[PDB]
Structures are given as C-alpha cells and as structure tokens.
C-alpha cells in the first residue's frame, strides 16, 4: 500500500486512499490470524463448516421465496 | 538425445566476454553430435530486485538438443565461473525455433 500525494490534492482524500488500499491488500486479517498456532484438525474442521453453512443458507434462501407470509 | 532450454545472466561490468562465452559453449555442444535450435542475446536489462547489490544484468537465451553428460559439464562450468550470477536449465517436449516476445517488442 504505497500512496503518493498528488498536486493540489487535499489531505483527507489521500488518507482515504490509504485506508482503501490497505483494506484491499488485507494485512490486518493476516496479522490477526498469525497470532497463535492452529492445529491441522482445527483448520480442516473450520473449512468444512464454512462450506456446509454457505451451501445450506443458499438453498434455504432460494427455496424460501415460494411462500406467502400474509 | 533430449531437448533443453537454457538462460543465463552476467555481471554488467563484464559484457565484453559474452561473445567468447557463446562461441565456447556452442562449440562444446556441437562437438558431441548436438544441434542448436535458437540463440538470442538480450543485452542489459533492469532487475526487479537487487542481486548482490546490483541491478542491470546481461541476459542470454539458448534452445538446444544434446546428451546429458554435456549438460552436466555445462552446469559445472556455470557453478565455477564468477561472471555468471544466475542460470536456469529446463526440459522441453519438442524443438523450439520461433521468436521470443523479447525480440518482438523490445
């Protein structure tokens, strides 16, 4: 995330550009997840749980639009 | 015999020996019933990150067909020479004779 202040450019715009670039790069997430060690079992379990939850939510929301609430 | 692609890089302040190097290696390959399919000399280029406090390396590319003992000896020469700072040897499926993207838009 490298930001160069352009001519005539105010300071708030540059600051917001900095924040947006860092959000796109995603450094805070990496730093937070590398703080403690995680076992391979826990890693695999988290991945599977996320996939199952996402699939089920998609199915439920796609099948919930065939009923009338009132 | 198999088909190989070779790339090597040279110190910027020793660019006056590259033609002699090319001649010597080509002679070594051709003396053992080998062939040379493509040869290219790219000149000096800016590096993407420094190597040993340097930028601006000199690049050479070759595409050949030869036995394995010759390639082994060539690698040994690269290892023990001090003008060469990096090198790569790869295997190919067929001979390559077309032109590279570096001799079409440089």
């Amino acid at each position: 995330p490298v930001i160069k202040v352009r001519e005539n450019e105010p300071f708030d715009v540059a600051l917001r550009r900095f924040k947006r670039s860092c959000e796109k790069a995603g450094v805070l997430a990496e730093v937070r997840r590398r703080e403690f060690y995680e076992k391979p079992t826990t890693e695999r379990k988290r991945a599977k749980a996320s996939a199952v939850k996402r699939h089920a939510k998609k199915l439920a929301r796609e099948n919930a639009r065939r009923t009338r609430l009132y | 015999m198999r088909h190989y692609e070779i790339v090597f890089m040279v110190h910027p302040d020793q660019s006056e020996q590259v033609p002699g190097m090319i001649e010597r290696y080509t002679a070594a390959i051709t003396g053992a019933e080998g062939k040379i399919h493509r040869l290219e000399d790219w000149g000096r280029r800016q590096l993407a990150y420094p190597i040993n406090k340097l930028h601006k390396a000199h690049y050479v590319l070759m595409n050949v067909e030869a036995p394995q003992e010759v390639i082994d000896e060539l690698e040994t020469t690269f290892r023990f020479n001090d003008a060469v700072i990096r090198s790569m040897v790869m295997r190919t499926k067929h001979a390559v004779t077309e032109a590279s993207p570096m001799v079409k838009a440089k």
């Binding site: 995330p1 | 993407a48 990150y49 390396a57 990096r86 790569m88 993207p101």
Partner: protein, 66 residues
Amino acid sequence: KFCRFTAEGVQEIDYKDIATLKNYITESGKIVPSRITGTRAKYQRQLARAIKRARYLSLLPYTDRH
C-alpha cells in the same frame, strides 16, 4: 465463465510473456484468484507455474517493497 486462454486455444502460457502475466497479479505482486478473473482450472495452474518461474528469473517482483 469467459476464459481468454480457452477462447484463443493456447498450449502454454510462456513465462517469458510479461505483458500477459501482468494482467493476473495485483499491485503488491500477489496472484489473483480464479473466481474473480473467470479462468479455468487447467490454465490457472499453468499460470501460477509461469509466474513463479518469472519471479525466480527476476523479471517480476515478489513484493512491492524490496
């Protein structure tokens, strides 16, 4: 999803082609996921191989701060 390599019928991705390889890395030097660019799996794998070869030969960077 649209794939340029499949559309043009390519055999290899040519680690020497910096112009093509530039379209698949971010401003930090990271490889871009396939679900954003719409490539196929075969060609995504070939592409990662090519980018790593270029990184070693020093035609591409590893990170934006060296």
